[PDB]
Amino acid sequence: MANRMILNETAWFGRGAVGALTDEVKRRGYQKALIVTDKTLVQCGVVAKVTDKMDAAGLAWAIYDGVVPNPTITVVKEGLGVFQNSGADYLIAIGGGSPQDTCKAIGIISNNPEFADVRSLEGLSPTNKPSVPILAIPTTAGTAAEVTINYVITDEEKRRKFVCVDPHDIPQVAFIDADMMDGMPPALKAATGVDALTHAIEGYITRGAWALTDALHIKAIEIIAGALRGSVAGDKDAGEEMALGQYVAGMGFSNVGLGLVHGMAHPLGAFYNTPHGVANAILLPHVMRYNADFTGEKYRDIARVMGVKVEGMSLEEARNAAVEAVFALNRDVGIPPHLRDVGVRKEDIPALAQAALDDVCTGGNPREATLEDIVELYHTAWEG
């Protein structure tokens, strides 16, 4: 009956937050870090923002930049080998959800060698030891991987993304610095931003929701809905707001769950390598309409913080307004509205739906989804 909360024991927030990293490392006595990131972040100079500071403080580090969007089992094994050989005693994840999840997988397996095949970590990972210490530095404003206890890896052999949930993978310190995120192309800010909004909305209405997560989630929705357009536009302060909002969303959903949006988005990532946030964005409003009757007064709350004047509006009208506010936001930030626009094939829907039905996140959906329900949702999101 009791509710558990897993959070970062230490976290730094604000532009310039990464400047606290060298002092945190020194106070922990670590000797060498393995930075887990990708080639784009190295090319854009984002990784240098961190290594330059580390060099100035005389802190040793090595880099693994083989991470690819929607990280695969192959990437995890490659990164793991690099880490084991490096002799590093801690990990620094620099990037969005892909590098951060890869980093979590590496840290967990390094101290829990029984899960060497990686795929065995799906669900509530029965690990016995904490991951190698992880210092997380997000570069996107959407996944909250720095504070959640989950990470998703793509099993290419079985063509499916599997979510791993494990308190042992929580980063020891997170640095939420908007300076690390400004380089995101506007389209990326939009996709990861709606991914964050999806986290907050699904988390707010998830089956396991309770007082504390509801408070975190509704604040996150308000912050995100109020700052996303401005951030996509390039506004500096909105970018900092988004950095906080996406993190606050994570403080909640990591501890209670999500729903059918993520359950349906994962198979798309596995089948087409579709960007996670774009998949969530397209599916979100449709899944919300589907869940409407099972959400109490919560859609009135969502609509209210998304700019809609809900006073004197019926619950039915408020629910329609919440869904429309999301459709509107997606249009405003430029995300394609139909699944056909992003490479999905109708012939694959039966398999995608079954995959969605079996996805870890689907169980938290307020409405118990059937196979045909999911098939219908994919077809509805196909072209409107």
Binding residues for Fe cation, as ranges, are: 195, 199, 262, 276
CB of 180 to ligand APR, least distance (A): 6
Residue with tokens 């990164």: 79
Burial of residue 296 (CB within 10 Å: 0-12, 13-18, 19+) is exposed
* Piece in contact with its own copies (CB under 8 A), picked from 5-13, 90-98, 256-264, 319-327: 5-13
What sign does the dihedral 168-193-248-322 (CA atoms) show?
A: negative
Using alpha carbons, select from 318, 332, 222, 204 the residue that is nearest to residue 261: 204
Of 166 and 195, the one with the shorter C-beta distance to Zn ion is 195
**What contacts 362, CB < 8 A, 6 or more positions away?**
259, 260, 262, 263, 264, 356, 369
Could you tell me how many residues of this chain bind its own copies (CB under 8 A)?
29
Please report which helix (H) or strand (E) contains residue 61, including its range: strand 60-64
* Piece in contact with its own copies (CB under 8 A), picked from 80-88, 182-190, 206-214, 281-289: 206-214
Using CB under 8 A as the criterion, what x/- string covers residues 229-248 for binding its own copies? ---------------x---x
Instruction: Scan residues 119-178 and list those touching its own copies (CB under 8 A).
Output: 167, 170, 177
Using alpha carbons, select from 144, 178, 109, 106 the residue that is nearest to residue 262: 144
Q: Which of Zn ion, Fe ion, its own copies, none does residue 258 bind to, with CB < 5 to 8 Å depending on kind? A: Fe ion
> Tokens for 32?
């060498």
DSSP 8-state assignment for residue 360: G
Among 14, 69, 167, 226, binds ligand APR (CB under 6 A): 69
Cα 64 to Cα 139: distance, rounded to the nearest angstrom: 16
| Residue 195 binding Zn ion, by CB under 5 A | yes
| Residue 356 binding Fe ion, by CB under 5 A | no
Neighbours of 231 (CB within 10 A): 28
Are the CB atoms for 291 and 206 separated by under 8 Å? no
CB of 359 to Fe ion, least distance (A): 8
Point out which residues pair with 150 in neighbouring strands. 165
| Residue 14 binding its own copies, by CB under 8 A | yes
CB of 261 to Zn ion, least distance (A): 8
Phi/psi for 160 (5° steps) reads -160, 140
**What contacts 2, CB < 8 A, 6 or more positions away?**
none
CB of 24 to its own copies, least distance (A): 10
Could you tell me how many residues of this chain bind Zn ion (CB under 5 A)?
1
Among 19, 69, 183, 230, binds its own copies (CB under 8 A): 19
DSSP 8-state assignment for residue 113: G
User: Which residues belong to the annotated binding site?
Assistant: 38, 70, 97-101, 139-143, 148-150, 161, 180-184, 195, 199, 262, 276, 341
Among 152, 224, 225, 288, binds ligand APR (CB under 6 A): 152
Q: What is the DSSP string of 117-178?
A: TSGGG-EE----SPPSPEEEEE-SSS--TTT-SEEEEEETTTTEEEEEE-GGG--SEEEE-G
CB of 354 to ligand APR, least distance (A): 19
Of 133 and 259, the one with the shorter C-beta distance to Zn ion is 259
CB of 263 to Fe ion, least distance (A): 8
CB of 170 to its own copies, least distance (A): 6
Of 128 and 372, the one with the shorter C-beta distance to its own copies is 128
Instruction: Scan residues 229-248 and list those touching Fe ion (CB under 5 A).
Output: none
SS3 of residue 80 by DSSP = helix
Cα 187 to Cα 232: distance, rounded to the nearest angstrom: 7
Among 258, 287, 303, 323, binds Fe ion (CB under 5 A): 258
User: Which residues belong to the annotated binding site for NAD(+)?
Assistant: 38, 70, 97-101, 139-143, 148-150, 161, 180-184, 276, 341
Cα 97 to Cα 119: distance, rounded to the nearest angstrom: 18
Contact positions vs ligand APR (CB under 6 A): 38, 40-41, 44, 46, 69-70, 95-99, 101, 139-140, 142-143, 152, 181, 183-184, 188, 192, 195, 269, 276-277
Residues that bind its own copies (CB under 8 A): 1-17, 19-20, 167, 170, 177, 210-212, 215, 219, 244, 248
